[PDB]
Design an enzyme around this catalytic site. Sequence first.
Site, PDB file in Angstrom:
ATOM      1  N   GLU A   1       0.833  -1.198   0.000  1.00  0.00           N
ATOM      2  CA  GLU A   1       0.000   0.000   0.000  1.00  0.00           C
ATOM      3  C   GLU A   1       0.868   1.248   0.000  1.00  0.00           C
ATOM      4  O   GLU A   1       1.710   1.431   0.893  1.00  0.00           O
ATOM      5  CB  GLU A   1      -0.894  -0.024   1.238  1.00  0.00           C
ATOM      6  CG  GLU A   1      -2.106   0.870   1.204  1.00  0.00           C
ATOM      7  CD  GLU A   1      -2.610   1.208   2.609  1.00  0.00           C
ATOM      8  OE1 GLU A   1      -1.808   1.471   3.513  1.00  0.00           O
ATOM      9  OE2 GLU A   1      -3.921   1.224   2.792  1.00  0.00           O
TER      10      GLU A   1
HETATM   11  C1  LIG Z   1      -4.393   1.778   4.029  1.00  0.00           C
HETATM   12  O1  LIG Z   1      -4.728   3.138   3.801  1.00  0.00           O
HETATM   13  C2  LIG Z   1      -5.711   3.355   2.769  1.00  0.00           C
HETATM   14  C3  LIG Z   1      -5.831   4.873   2.526  1.00  0.00           C
HETATM   15  O2  LIG Z   1      -5.724   5.514   3.787  1.00  0.00           O
HETATM   16  C4  LIG Z   1      -7.027   2.647   3.155  1.00  0.00           C
HETATM   17  O3  LIG Z   1      -7.522   3.150   4.379  1.00  0.00           O
HETATM   18  C5  LIG Z   1      -6.707   1.163   3.384  1.00  0.00           C
HETATM   19  O4  LIG Z   1      -7.857   0.445   3.791  1.00  0.00           O
HETATM   20  C6  LIG Z   1      -5.645   0.988   4.451  1.00  0.00           C
HETATM   21  F1  LIG Z   1      -5.373  -0.369   4.617  1.00  0.00           F
END
Ligand SMILES: *[C@H]1O[C@H](CO)[C@H](O)[C@H](O)[C@H]1F
Lengths: 484, 484, 489, 489
Positions: free
Chosen positions: D387
């Site tokens: 992510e």
């Molecule tokens: C990682 O962050 C993103 C953006 O903030 C989303 O909230 C995802 O669910 C999280 F795992």
Amino acid sequence: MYSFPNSFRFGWSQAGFQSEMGTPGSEDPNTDWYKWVHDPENMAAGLVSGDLPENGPGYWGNYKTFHDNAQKMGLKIARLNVEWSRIFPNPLPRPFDESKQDVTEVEINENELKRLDEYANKDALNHYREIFKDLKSRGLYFILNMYHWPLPLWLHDPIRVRRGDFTGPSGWLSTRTVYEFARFSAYIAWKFDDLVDEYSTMNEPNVVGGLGYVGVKSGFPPGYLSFELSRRAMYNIIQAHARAYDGIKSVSKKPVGIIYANSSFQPLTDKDMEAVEMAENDNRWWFFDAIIRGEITEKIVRDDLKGRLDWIGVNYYTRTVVKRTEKGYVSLGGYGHGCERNSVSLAGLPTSDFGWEFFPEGLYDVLTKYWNRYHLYMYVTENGIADDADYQRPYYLVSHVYQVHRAINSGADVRGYLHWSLADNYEWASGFSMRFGLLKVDYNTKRLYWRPSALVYREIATNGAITDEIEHLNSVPPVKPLRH
Amino acid sequence: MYSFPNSFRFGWSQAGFQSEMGTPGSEDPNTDWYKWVHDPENMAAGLVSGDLPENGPGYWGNYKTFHDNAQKMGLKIARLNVEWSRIFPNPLPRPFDESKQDVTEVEINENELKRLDEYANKDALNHYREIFKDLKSRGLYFILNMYHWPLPLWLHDPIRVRRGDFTGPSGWLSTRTVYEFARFSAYIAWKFDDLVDEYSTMNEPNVVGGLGYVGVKSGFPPGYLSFELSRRAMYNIIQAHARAYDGIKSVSKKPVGIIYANSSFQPLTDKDMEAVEMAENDNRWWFFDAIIRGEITEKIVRDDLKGRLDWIGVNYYTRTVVKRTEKGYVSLGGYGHGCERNSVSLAGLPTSDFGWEFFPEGLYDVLTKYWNRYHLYMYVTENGIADDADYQRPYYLVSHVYQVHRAINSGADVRGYLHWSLADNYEWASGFSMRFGLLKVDYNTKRLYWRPSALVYREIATNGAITDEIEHLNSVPPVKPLRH
Amino acid sequence: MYSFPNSFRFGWSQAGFQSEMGTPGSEDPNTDWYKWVHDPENMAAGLVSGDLPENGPGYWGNYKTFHDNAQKMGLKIARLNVEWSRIFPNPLPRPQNFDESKQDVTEVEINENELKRLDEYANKDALNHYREIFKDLKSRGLYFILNMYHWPLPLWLHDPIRVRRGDFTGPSGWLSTRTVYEFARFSAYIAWKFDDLVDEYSTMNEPNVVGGLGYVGVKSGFPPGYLSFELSRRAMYNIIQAHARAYDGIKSVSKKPVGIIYANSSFQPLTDKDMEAVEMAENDNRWWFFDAIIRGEITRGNEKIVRDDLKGRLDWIGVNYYTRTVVKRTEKGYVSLGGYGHGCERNSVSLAGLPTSDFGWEFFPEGLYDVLTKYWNRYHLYMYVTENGIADDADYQRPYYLVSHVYQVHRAINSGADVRGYLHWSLADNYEWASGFSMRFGLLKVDYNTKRLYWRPSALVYREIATNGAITDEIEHLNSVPPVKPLRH
Amino acid sequence: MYSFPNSFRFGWSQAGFQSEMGTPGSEDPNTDWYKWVHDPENMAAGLVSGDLPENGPGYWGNYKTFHDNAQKMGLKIARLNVEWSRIFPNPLPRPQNFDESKQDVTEVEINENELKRLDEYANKDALNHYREIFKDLKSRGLYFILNMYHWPLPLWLHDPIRVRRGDFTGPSGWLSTRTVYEFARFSAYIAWKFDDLVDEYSTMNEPNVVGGLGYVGVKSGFPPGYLSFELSRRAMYNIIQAHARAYDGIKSVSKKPVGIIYANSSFQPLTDKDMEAVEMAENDNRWWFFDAIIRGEITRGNEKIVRDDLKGRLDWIGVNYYTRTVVKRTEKGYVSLGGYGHGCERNSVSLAGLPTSDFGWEFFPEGLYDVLTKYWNRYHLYMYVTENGIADDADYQRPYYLVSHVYQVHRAINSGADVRGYLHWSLADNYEWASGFSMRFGLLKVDYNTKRLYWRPSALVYREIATNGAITDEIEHLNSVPPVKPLRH
Ligand SMILES: *[C@H]1O[C@H](CO)[C@H](O)[C@H](O)[C@H]1F
Ligand SMILES: *[C@H]1O[C@H](CO)[C@H](O)[C@H](O)[C@H]1F
Ligand SMILES: *[C@H]1O[C@H](CO)[C@H](O)[C@H](O)[C@H]1F
Ligand SMILES: *[C@H]1O[C@H](CO)[C@H](O)[C@H](O)[C@H]1F
């Protein structure tokens, strides 16, 4: 508490052209500056704002109100000028060899003064006497300045010169102007000596030659770009100062000084200290060495220039940051007067409505450097900020007044602080939008209002001190709530 | 000029918990609020700032300086509270059926008051008497408020309740608190009547129940989210007001009022006027109809609630913009108290350090609506701005004071204006960063400084008017130089 | 989807002086503009930035790279100029049958013999280098619009410092009919030499800016910076007849279409009582010029005349467009307002809450539709959008600026206007006149140290447009105003 | 040029709850999160935005379009989760051989017979629909990382409103070992059903955010929002053993790699006297967790023990990264500072003068290199960047954000770190939890009215990266900080 000596005076400075007009009957159409700001081409080019000084604050009619407020504010000193053009609106008979470079002497005596008398506008002289009498009756000590930029049209047609035509009246490019200036100053001293406490010959002659002939985007007359002519104008202005000094001294025993525009020159890095000195030479010392020591440029000593100064009027707003170059030194944009309006400088310091950086330490720098070089006593003759909203002014005011205290404490002989200005006024090519007043002017009604900074200044002046209660204002205006 | 009646008074309001502590010896660890802001979990969650009230401005030790400055400022009225917890730090013997919903009567007499007397902290009572005596000796008219949010810990353990545990002391959820509040108020009136001019039972009870049990992101105790419990708290607070009224009247003939948090409700479009009325019903009238007309909720009339109010304390900062919905009405973000800090609202109006929109017209709205509904006389008991730099306060002050003048001119009986506040103080969950003082507090030394707005307020108060000279400040702070 | 005709072309415009220099051996010191920007007094006054064109992007040596990227990006049209000064760096002989005191230049005879004489004086290295650039251009399938003039005059025709100083005894640029005479000859000459490579011609780029900024808007630091209403009119009068004489000159040697490129703003009424103000503004800034060179209508001294030597001298109109001008009615006529259009603060918002560029220019795409359709309805000549773009080094606004203006051209065609291409200003960053290098208009970023070109995300957006001949569904959301909340106010 | 190994993959991550709903028939009302965001009291308190997930981007029905665009963009990896609640919307029978009072869950026996029983309870429409999504995924050549859990629990396992109210008599989510037991079974079950389609597994997404925001950072409006240091520890303890039990469960049915995805920030010292502060912060926020599930080291009550049932339960680490945290030494330990990292003003600048996002997160790409290399040196397990991205509706900063972070991964590999892919958060805008739809992280913009997807210029930049397996020379200037001068401060 920061207490000043019992003889120190707090007051203000103002200019005839910026503040006089606005009340019907006050109009003075006979200057280079009047013509210059009404010029259709200058207007279309944006060199002038389009605002006109006859729509101004109206000190000519309303001076009693101004003085009333100044008295309520506890002020004890004022510096104003007489407008040359008001007293001699019409050309005087040709006197004197106009092709001679130097003017070492201008002979003025009782008979010559009586002759001049017959050309003088008596309504204008009587009105000024009424203004100054009312000034003195409020217990205000009076510095009278002879010259604050406008020249009679009969001595300077600025549009002709702008156009590259040098066959007409050419202002400071002509020794005729030098000669007449010395006579004007002797004449005014002769007429007003009973009311005057100290004299200044001129206000910021460096700005007249500098913006007039180099910084032409400023929209100052005659706006003709020439390094050569800028030097010629400054050379003549220097001689005009010396001859005006001798002229006033022929008629009065009172102190004669000069008021000059200063920046505090500051090094970009610690490798730039020499650059600061060169900047100080080129912008300050060369001029003062001329009129104090007679040293000028081959490098000679002129005995007619030497010793022609009793005191120094220090005008100060902000710093100039410089760096060393191969060929010399340069000033840097993003600091001092070269910032964005209502923003922050490259150093994170707040800027004014005019884009000038908050830097009160510079004033201490400037006061102590003059003192250490020449040992002449000083007034702070101009200091202030363009700030219609009054956000920064309380801080600007207290911080600078503190630096003056600092300068005195270190030994410098500084005898007063005169804020620019008591009320809003016509800011030259910028028009009315640049508001420097402790008092706000509604230009529709000419009514004056007290900005909170005026109440702060009343505290300072009435007490002869930065009192305990306002001492926090000796700091930088918080930038976070301000525009960046 | 905007002149007020000769009997109108200008002053200030302050709270015990926000201003008392800061000088050694002033510490009061025995409230729900003290415990709440020292809580490790509350701190880690960011529900409280981590700032602590014992590092405050120190009114407990320094009250003479505060009053000194207020006198120099020409103030003639003050509203403060006594802290319940200071007078009764220890639990009182159980009195009364705790399962009964209504408290229609609390019997208080001379004997019962003498019994209470034996539990009271005498050092705290004597110190308050010293404070109030010094207050009265400066010619300050004195409104004494009984309650400004902290409850003795022995009546409320807020962390237990936050945790969902209702077996302990439960604050406004318990009629025991109602019963003891009536007794406390009679007791204080009994002790201080010789010094007091008017009484208020409580400060902003709507905020106590509203942020305590619904607006839990505010970090107000006990921070337990429940519509049901919020209603229960408000029901008890209403009864507590009525019983405190009867209690004070048993011991004093002087006027008894209440101080309440108001917004001016404003329609988003011209289709939203009904939404404004519903908002006014739900946020204002329901409460006042209870304690004035005895009307409460089935919809009944309680004779023990009816007529329990002599005057209305109007607290005001800003507006709330509402629109009509299918199901009712909603408030809009981007206006009123729901803006970005140090910025502009969706309407282009400047916001404070707290994100509250500049909207002085709302005060006229609120004053005249109360007047037209109930015809009770009013004070403006709280009005001010979070503004450490003092950029907006001069405008905020003059504009709101003008709207009060407007309200009087239209017929409303408004008898004073009390600015929030004389000096900076501890702003609840927000800590010290929200600075509402006419005087700036340096928390390291507890020294007070006059912001330029204090000098402006001195003008207003000394003259009993917005004078000609400061009348320009009845306008919106210019947004262009401010942060957006 | 917004689809363009199959014959519509997307490309770019560029100017010799702004883009050529920067590579070893590319220097051209022989123009008024070159002298103007190196001038010590101009520098000290801050009339010019102190940046110098010889440190520029180096198209003279790197043109193959530029063309490479333009082809990668799917571009199919380009409009460039030849620099007059590079071709004739030295003066030509004072001409036969020419009276310098005559106000009007109704004819300039050029024949094959005269052309062959001129050829003796032309710089051959320059001519051959330009052939090499243009051949390479055409080899990438780019249609070529060749413009004759984009502001710099050879110094032998204009010494701007002398004129700035109020000295009219020397070479005086557009104030002299000699310059008109020579421009005609120059244009015929270039057409004669390059016609095998050219698709369409423009005589001039933005003559109204040359006269206007040169002689009235002097704070802009344009040469010769001599403030005079009277001399601005004289310069414009001469530039008009120069355009006509150049059109005849090109037509004597070529059959191809000959147009002009002109600086436009969209005049907009402040309030609904200001619609006549707009028409007067359009008259004074636009129609007066084009009525002269299309209809032959002009004013000479005090009289409204028709000149048969001016009439009909235009085949197409190059529309240059950045932003609007807001005007209001006055007693004496009309005025422009600050805080809109090109008179805003840089990196801010206008008084209407619209975002401004690095140059302080207001985002206003609907003005392009206004300008294209107004020209169409008055004259019915086909047009090209020859200049449109934004000063935006960070690339924040450009993706929106590009898609939105391209949409407004689609809207213009849909309404019936004959518009045949769109040419972004510009392919790559360049030297922005008195402003120097800080104003960056490129789809490509230039690192001035290495001369390397970089694709701004807007260049990728433009590639989508050009390769598809459309605003595709995927990028259509860019047809909107850049969000102002995250930007500086 | 910054080139990646030939085996490195660029792609994206997405979550079921955030992206699935929006199309007719996609609704899943049976989670704690669903109930949490529809709750009237939560709404009135402003704990949740009032936006509802059922008005979302509609991946459930439009997944073919998403996949179409991802393939156009040259992506080669995807990481998605199955929503537990869609598979088991109703409770399962209380299990055999299970003592709810035991702190530790060291084993959960799952065999083929147990799996076949579970299959009787699973929603078949949901299972078949997920197969259809994943088949389509694999058909575009995307490598598939299947994550088991991304925050929502079935309501029969957690009623968050009850727990918010301080009532622990009902289904209590991660506070109950029952949830641990069921999670193990669920993961084995999903692996058993989908292993033919899966390339790699993750058990969980950001467990530290679940426990941390759920039970301490309550202003964030995460369920159950019950403020308790003690219950946060208990939830984390259970989530750790759930991860271990799920790994064993998946391994009983599959040979494929099983990892975990975790929320990371880069801890940075305020001054050079704060380096120990950073190490303590790294211990408390990162190492304690991974030492548990890799080395079996944990604390239970008051003692530091090694659990053989926790040891070695990890094959790879999913690195989630947005920004840094600045820490300073205290007498009592260390503290984080506001005005840096995730604690800045939105659309502004940090105290270090770095630009912040729509969410108030500080631009700090070097933190990613810090995090990847620290994990590498401690554990030597291969990782994915699972992510990374920015809340940026206007697309101003994202082009810089993307190129810069991708550069930092290249730098990590160069230093020796085994990093096998980069997955942007996210392909398209989605429902950002308590913040609702206003936080837009997509390479593609979603119009929530039509559910149409649009390419932001950053998506075109990403296509360049992915199709080339490199930051190409042409976009390399984006490896820098978005210029702050044109942005809001
Ligand atoms: C990682 O962050 C993103 C953006 O903030 C989303 O909230 C995802 O669910 C999280 F795992
Ligand atoms: C000094 O500066 C002020 C503010 O700019 C005025 O211009 C004065 O006339 C000048 F002397
Ligand atoms: C009214 O508002 C002020 C400013 O927020 C303080 O919180 C007071 O205690 C409250 F009554
Ligand atoms: C059109 O404008 C651009 C950018 O301002 C350049 O100045 C061109 O030369 C001009 F023609």
